[PDB]
Amino acid sequence: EFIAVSTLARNLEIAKGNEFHTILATLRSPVYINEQLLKSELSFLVTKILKLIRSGNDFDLWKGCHTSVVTCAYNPLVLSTHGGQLLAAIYSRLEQKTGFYSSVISSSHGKQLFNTLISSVAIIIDLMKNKPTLSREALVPKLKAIIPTLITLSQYEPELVLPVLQRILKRNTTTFKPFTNKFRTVLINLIISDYASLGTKTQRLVCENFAYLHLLDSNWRTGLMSILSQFKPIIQLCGEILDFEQDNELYKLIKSLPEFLPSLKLDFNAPLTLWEIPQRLSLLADMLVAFISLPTPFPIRVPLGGINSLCEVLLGVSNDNELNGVINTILPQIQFQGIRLWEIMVSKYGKCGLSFFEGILSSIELFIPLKKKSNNEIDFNVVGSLKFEFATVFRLVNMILSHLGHQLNIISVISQLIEVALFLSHDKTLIDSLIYTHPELFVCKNSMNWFNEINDFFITALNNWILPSTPHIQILKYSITQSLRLKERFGYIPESFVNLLRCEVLHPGSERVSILPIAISLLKNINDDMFELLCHPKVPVGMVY
Amino acid sequence: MDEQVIFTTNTSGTIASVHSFEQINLRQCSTQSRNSCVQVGNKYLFIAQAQKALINVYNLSGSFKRESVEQRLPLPEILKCLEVVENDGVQYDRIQGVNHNLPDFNLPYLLLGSTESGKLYIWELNSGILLNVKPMAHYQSITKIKSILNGKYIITSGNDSRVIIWQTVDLVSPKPLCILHDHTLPVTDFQVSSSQGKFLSCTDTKLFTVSQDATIRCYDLSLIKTPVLLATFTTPYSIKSIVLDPADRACYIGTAEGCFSLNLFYKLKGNAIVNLLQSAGVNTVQKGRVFSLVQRNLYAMGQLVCENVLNSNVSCLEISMDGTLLLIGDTEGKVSIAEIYSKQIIRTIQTLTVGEVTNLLTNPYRLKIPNLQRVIFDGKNKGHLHDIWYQIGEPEADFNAYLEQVKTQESIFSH
């Protein structure tokens, strides 16, 4: 019946994996909430855990914090009785173990130790927020001393600490107040660094925490407009090399735009130093994304026309020897920071900004690299580098057409994007400029996780447009050939191609004849129920009574 | 890409693609049966010989196909009919998608084979094990067997004018589900809709049945119950064979003195178009309409206009993946590739080395085996090890993810 929790406690001071995991697993059971073991047996377990955490060989500590986490999560009485004492012990060990950091990270287990301690503190103070009476008198006299330690530790371990301070700053905006300057310093020291040794997650977290720093109606607006105003100097610095006023409607808009960062220097004899310009614009875009896409405890003014104008002027930036070669690569990356901002302005706000959904699609044509000589032809060698960016473009288009829907008039950007997507759907080879008797082994074959993205884009195109003939026949040939190839290689057809053939059957558009019976010939032993309804239709849905 | 025709006469084994004008005559083949050939596991072709009591096995995977017999398979009895139950739903790895390639060794689960006097032999193919033998199912013969869904149900037809629907789990571990006596003379063929679902409760699956009674009977299959017919037609000529369009838009019937067509979405003289086959799930009336066919030389009299395509004494029919070409086998041992609309032959395939076209097949394509056990039955033993031969097949095996790995890596160094 009952597993005698004293037995778990006494077998816990020594327990390796295949015993310790059973101890943690059986302690989930709710029958340890019951009369007259609530003052004499849980006390024994908690004193055992406390003796494990208070002094140990750094294995009993890891074991102990995991044990307290599981116990407090699956038993609210242990929380309401002893959570303050457990959290005090864990914070004390964290404090002594972060008083030194370069003698505690010396053995490849200090990192995991900080991970488990920080995670355990976070989990405890994420369960003591559903109890007002308990968030008093166990956390609030302790956060004043918890938070400076976490700040000092975030200088070295931002990937692990910053979500905790983010949640604490968000749920408590009045105890983080007198430490706020001390936080800001470290965040400017983490942005003044190279800022590419940090991951995307860490970059986003420092941006988000700097954004939530300004919670202390109006300060959010000041920080937001400061970051928005730090865009125009960089663009005018880029305008001394692209020679604007060749097109004046752009230069009218550039001067129509409205601080801790260094004013940067550029040298043309060292063209690699031109990689500072994208690596500042991406930074400011991340900070802007943080100020915009985050939740708040109050509403906020967000300028949408301003950032739309900013995105519009970013994608206008396009068309001694190696310098020209380096200029031919930074500019797509510059445009992509307009793409990356419209993708967040679209999904998070949705139909707000419906007015801008037609200009974005026209401006995406500027992102496409054309051949240099005079022509409207696509430069496929540049497109081979830009794969992730064009995937982001495809997701942006699919985000827009969820709201716009089917479109009467057609535009030219979609046909060029289809040509791009059909180029990217071909198995790349990188020996074409020239063997060793086998040039077919030097290919980069396209996974199915990429074909899914391409096929979702073609679904969006065939749904909402009556396309021209040749950009339709290419799609049909692609779908049929690849489906047959995969049905030979495999014994089946993946689901994205089936969805593509479904859309090709349902939405033929300008065609005078469907591809229905060929889809069924391919779907011979892979049956599906869409075409049953099409060929063998059903009685309506209310005739039955 | 192109389509591939595998047809065999009583003394000839030709294989040829439709748009290639190249062909391979298999050396040793003999048949006097209507449907006796099958293509097994995209690596093999099985043909049941006549008057030898064995199956010939040809390897058809090569770039230069094996003209000769790759292998033989003796049997207990000479048997006429064949059908295969293809294994599906094993290559995706539904637990997590890895999209396994096919192995070099693949096989189906079953090999249905039926002989004269109505006996049915079914064999596991991964290991030759005769799981079950039904001594008598039809009481004169069997002429065609087909698995309509993947391995779920199989349908049989013989010369007792009864078409039987089994259930594969109730046949291999028999008491069939339903029997169909609506014909009076031997049922020579049937066909089922190429468009199908995963189940029968939410589909209306059409079964066309054809006999020497000069009738064509269209049955609605949706059970959960018995099937209900909703139309039957009638013919002046002794009908022999039948195929459908790949979407159940038409019917094409092969018979003595020509091959005839029939539109199922029948267009009247008001620009009014009537679907003869309308139905639902299990709720459906039993009032099967009657109509009669008459050639070309408006339907409330009980007559319908079939359009004559050809004048050849056809034995068998098949259809292309487009749904626009018929491949018809005459009694002079040659195939005609014809176009449905214009009624103009485009190609004529003969064999080179004679009897009629026994059977033929088509599927599109792009540019050892166990011995069968003669009278042995795997019983209710549990200590028996039901060993099979099997192979799984490898799974299919960018840069921004690599750079993100690099960015996460760089933080650990203080240098």
């Binding site: - | 192109d2 979407a247 838009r249 626009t324 176009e339």
Partner: peptide, 24 residues
Amino acid sequence: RNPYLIPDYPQPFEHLKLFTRELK
């Protein structure tokens, strides 16, 4: 007129070029 019916012209699906082989 209807896309999902048998058309009234002889060679449909000739403009998809599935079965053609281009000469090089």
